Ligand binder design. Structure first.
Ligand SMILES: *[C@]1(=O)[C]N(C(=O)[C]C2=[C][C]=[C]C(C3=[C][C]=[C][C]=N3)=[C]2)[C][C][C][C]1[N]C(=O)[C]([C][C]([C])[C])[N]C(=O)C1=[C]C2=C([C]=[C]C(O[C][C]N3[C][C]O[C][C]3)=[C]2)O1
Length: 215
């Protein structure tokens, strides 16, 4: 078995979503990490509610942005997270309207990838499934990506600003990569995804704030 894997084939990832006019990339990165663990722990693939995290994770800033841990931690002490269907996405901070009857998953903590260790992140993705990662996506070469293994020597590992989802890793034209799932719609990048340089010195700081939830 070639040392590369795409959890999309395994059935661990749901369709690509679009956050609309909202800075909720942290909420989708989290959800997809949970969506992945849920399918591992129970064999079911469901769409979890990111609106849930936007409206209720007060450790974050709604559409103003946020981090994934604070999200996983909320699910923990909340004893659950609704599903997309129970808590639909409207693309705008509203009042928390969490419904326990909607609860479609939960988690007993999370684990961080050691900072800047692509080896670690590789193992994780391999042994756990979709991992949540943060990156530098402010560059225009990113925003207009469409094919091949991305890499811009102007990416700044210290300027993380986007929460995306590692869902695999492989090799294209001999170029090691990271299958990344974005939340800007299916018409962005390549059907919503984007291959990002792997082992090229932690490009855009891919493994600089990596994490996944414990279920
Ligand atoms: C993400 O959404 C990433 N960003 C975007 O994606 C912008 C965008 C939006 C819509 C469409 C498109 C697009 C682009 C190209 C083609 C098509 N469409 C793009 C940019 C910014 C917004 C958001 N970023 C984040 O959330 C970061 C992520 C992190 C680096 C992983 N985080 C933050 O911005 C952030 C985290 C915060 C914060 C403010 C306060 C915080 O602490 C609160 C602490 N306190 C609260 C009370 O309770 C106790 C704790 C944390 O900002």
């Amino acid at each position: 078995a070639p040392d590369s894997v795409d959890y999309r084939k395994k059935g661990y990832v749901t369709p690509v979503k679009n956050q609309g006019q909202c800075g909720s990339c942290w909420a989708f990165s989290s959800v997809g990490a949970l969506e992945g663990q849920l399918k591992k722990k129970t064999g079911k693939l469901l769409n979890l509610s990111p609106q849930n995290l936007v409206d209720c994770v007060s450790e974050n800033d709604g559409c103003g942005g946020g981090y994934m841990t604070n999200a996983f931690q909320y699910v923990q002490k909340n004893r659950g997270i609704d599903s997309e269907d129970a808590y639909p996405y409207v693309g705008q901070e509203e009042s928390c309207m969490y419904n326990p009857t909607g609860k479609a998953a939960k988690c007993r903590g999370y684990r961080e990838i050691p900072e800047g260790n692509e080896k670690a992140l590789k193992r994780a993705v391999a042994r756990v499934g979709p991992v949540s990662v943060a990156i530098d996506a402010s560059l225009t070469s990113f925003q207009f990506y469409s094919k091949g293994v991305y890499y811009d020597e102007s990416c700044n590992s210290d300027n993380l600003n986007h929460a995306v989802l590692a869902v695999g890793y492989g090799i294209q034209k001999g170029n090691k990569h990271w299958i990344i799932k974005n939340s800007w719609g299916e018409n962005w990048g390549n059907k919503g995804y984007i291959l990002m340089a792997r082992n090229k010195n932690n490009a855009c700081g891919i493994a600089n704030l990596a994490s996944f939830p414990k279920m």
